[PDB]
């Protein structure tokens, strides 16, 4: 199967869909949720979390099922086994606080020389690639040999929705990384492609993307854009219960 | 095989024993031993103990066996990996404290999707499933596909005997959890019969698990109840000297 | 091949070499080496020494091979995986400081049923078995089936040997445990071989072991008894340097 | 293939390259790019970094690499698992630190008796190997049977080069081991060469080392020595942010 890989960004809005393959599972990450229609459908074959809000995160993905918002067979965090990175008591204990969740490492590792190209820019230049490309490393680890990519635009505003949300901003105030650069995810993901051949398109022709990315091919393809009512557009928060339970775990 | 899984509630005294199986193996948990006639027989294929007092149940159990009381082919730890639920260093060593025994969870975190929905019950929910759905569990997780459940009550008095004994209020003066509801228990079983293609069934009509689960067919079998005479009706507390070597483990 | 089993009590003087089996290895175990003629001969299978003193003992022996003393294929470390029996960095990174050495708990473990019986005595009755019992276990558990006993006296006079030298006293100024008797070595041997099916022998009639254990067949073998001469009689101390390198591991 | 294991004693200048054999990989250590010429050629199957300065190293090593100075297969630290000769959270995160590189303990533990040669000489004795013998270890262990050396000459001037250079010095200082010997080297090389059926040359008629190792045999071979010009010949130094990122493994 191919794969399409999303950022947040605007240009998730701006996909151009006669692009759009036959044959694709669909990977979204962090605040996707917040989008105003169902731009990639609402089937995921895997969501992705960064360590710092996993525990929110879960908790809200799993109103997100049983609502019927959205589905996804697989639950990833996007860690790195780095100490800077995450808490150490959190990724040893993760599959016991989460049985159907992966760390996103078991696969990333496996991409080893990605691992170390990774490891020796953010450690030693403080440049870190952004969770879009972590994704497509870990699609390229998973077998996929066709990685189809939107909503990735280096935040060149900030996102396809308005993520000044209450609970998000209570959790993180800061949403009204300095080590993100175009630069540095443009070039990490011509080294996956060309270290691991495979193939790389882009489906937004209006995103900076398309300078570096070839287009996907016109198919004459058709999508239904289902739009989106009363639908979760901010994180939710745990109790307090549920917080002491997991004290352990977040710092 | 067959299995019948026993909780501690006043129906394990109300077994219509003209729907026992005829080929069944018995897992028994916590205080059973407390019982005054063998309702289920001498024999267990396992038998569950939680964690905060396994030292102690232990101890109590090597002596019904000597005793000859009753025997049990397994020996199970009613554990969950979880830091809020049992000690670190007593599920580290286990294995080499008591070596012919098992941690409950080497088995439970088989079920993966029950793993899941247990623990976000259990985190987010402050929602408990009880021993009695925890051995369903570790069964199915064995291999057994037809599942009697006796003495599960729903705390709806209190056991099929009197827990208040001198020792066992000693150790946990609170016999004289919240996190437990009926809903809770048939909400899991029901989760357990789909999700793992099994069939649970009740021994007890007069129950409030008839309520919800189908009966065991009638089958004309027949059950001698043997009584009890002079037998263990307490835990049994081990020396100080044993305590001092156990104590890393306990808290 | 057969195994003889030596403790170090006086009856190690008092074999029936007669009864000597035609085809064995021979277990010895901590100041074996103190003895004034080689009772069985200079050739090893294995040596045991327990976790206390390993440090100085494994130094001591790389001296005994090095002066042509003794020999000895293995080299056997007597733990049991308890934190109050040895220290527990000692037992982490063992084989990192003795890399031609094994813990003998990697071997006394397979015998599951016996270390249930060793860890159930041992924590709650304070009875322990002493090495000369811990090296059947061991032998067993390596596949042998037939063990010559010699040299395991009870304690009913204390060694075949004086064991008060100077640097032993230094060491450890207690040998000028008390959870030791007859009864509990006799029931441990009792239960390997009735467990195990395995064979027991004594090679000393005139032991208190002879009164329990059947004596090992005439076979009119013979055997030369070769004295000692300018020997290693006390154990050896490790310079200062060495033992601060170690001293995460003593205590 | 065949090996050749450079030290950087002053015979590193001093091969008699008629003696290069056939078909070589080349194992590097520590300042090896220090050397003004290419005495070995550019291309390294290995080169290998003592645990202190493995971190600037690594970071070093990428610029050689990248400036096209060098190419090496691999990466290994010379470590031993002992805690008093290298940090032990460094060890242990070594591969998600380091995802290209190797521990060269995984490599020297699996020669058992020299890894048990090297612990007791280290430990109890404080004669230590130099990493030209570890270097030997290592590549007996990957499968090499005919090793050649040069550049070991057992400080008998210092180094095939200046190291006072000003970031090596103020890394560390002490550039302007006692534990090692030409005895302690000679006799671990006999050891591994006996132990381990392989065949080691000396490539240096003119060191102290070939006293005691025979000449590699004349084969009328040709090699280019690649004169060096505006190169690397100091190690490079982390920036602060590195440093911060990396501060539980140092120290
Ligand atoms: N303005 C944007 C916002 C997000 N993205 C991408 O979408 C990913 C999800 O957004 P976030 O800020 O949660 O990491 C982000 O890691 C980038 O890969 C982007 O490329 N440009
Ligand atoms: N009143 C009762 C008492 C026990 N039980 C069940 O029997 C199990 C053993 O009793 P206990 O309180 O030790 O957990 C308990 O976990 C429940 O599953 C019950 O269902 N109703
Ligand atoms: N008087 C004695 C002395 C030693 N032993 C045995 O020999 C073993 C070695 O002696 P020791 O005290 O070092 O454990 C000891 O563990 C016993 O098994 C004995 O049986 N009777
Ligand atoms: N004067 C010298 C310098 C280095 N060496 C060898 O080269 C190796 C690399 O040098 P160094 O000091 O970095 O360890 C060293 O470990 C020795 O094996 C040597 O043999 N004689």
Not at 115 to 124: G, L, P, R, V
Not at 148 to 160: E, K, N, R, V
């Amino acid at each position: 199967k191919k794969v399409i890989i999303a950022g947040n960004g605007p240009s998730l809005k701006e996909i151009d869909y006669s692009r759009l393959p036959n044959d694709f599972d669909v990977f979204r990450c962090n605040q996707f949720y917040f989008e105003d229609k169902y731009y990639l459908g609402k089937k995921c074959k895997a969501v992705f979390y960064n360590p710092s809000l996993f525990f929110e995160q879960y908790y809200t993905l799993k109103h997100l099922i049983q609502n019927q918002e959205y589905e996804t067979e697989l639950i990833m965090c996007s860690n790195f086994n780095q100490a800077h990175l995450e808490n150490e008591n959190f990724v040893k204990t993760f599959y016991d606080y989460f049985p159907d969740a992966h760390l996103g490492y078991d696969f990333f590792k496996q991409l080893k020389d990605f691992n170390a190209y990774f490891k020796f820019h953010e450690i030693y230049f403080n440049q870190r690639i952004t969770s879009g490309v972590y994704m497509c490393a870990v699609a390229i680890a998973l077998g996929y040999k066709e990685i189809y990519l939107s909503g990735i635009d280096f935040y060149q505003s900030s996102y396809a929705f308005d993520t000044k949300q209450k609970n998000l901003l209570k959790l993180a105030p800061n949403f009204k990384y300095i080590g993100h650069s175009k630069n540095t995810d443009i070039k990490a993901l011509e080294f996956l492609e060309k270290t691991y051949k495979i193939k790389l398109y882009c489906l937004c022709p209006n995103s900076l993307l398309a300078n570096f990315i070839g287009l996907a091919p016109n198919l004459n393809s058709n999508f239904i854009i289902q739009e989106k009512n009363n639908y979760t557009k901010d994180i939710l928060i745990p109790s307090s219960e549920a917080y002491g339970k997991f004290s352990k775990n977040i710092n």
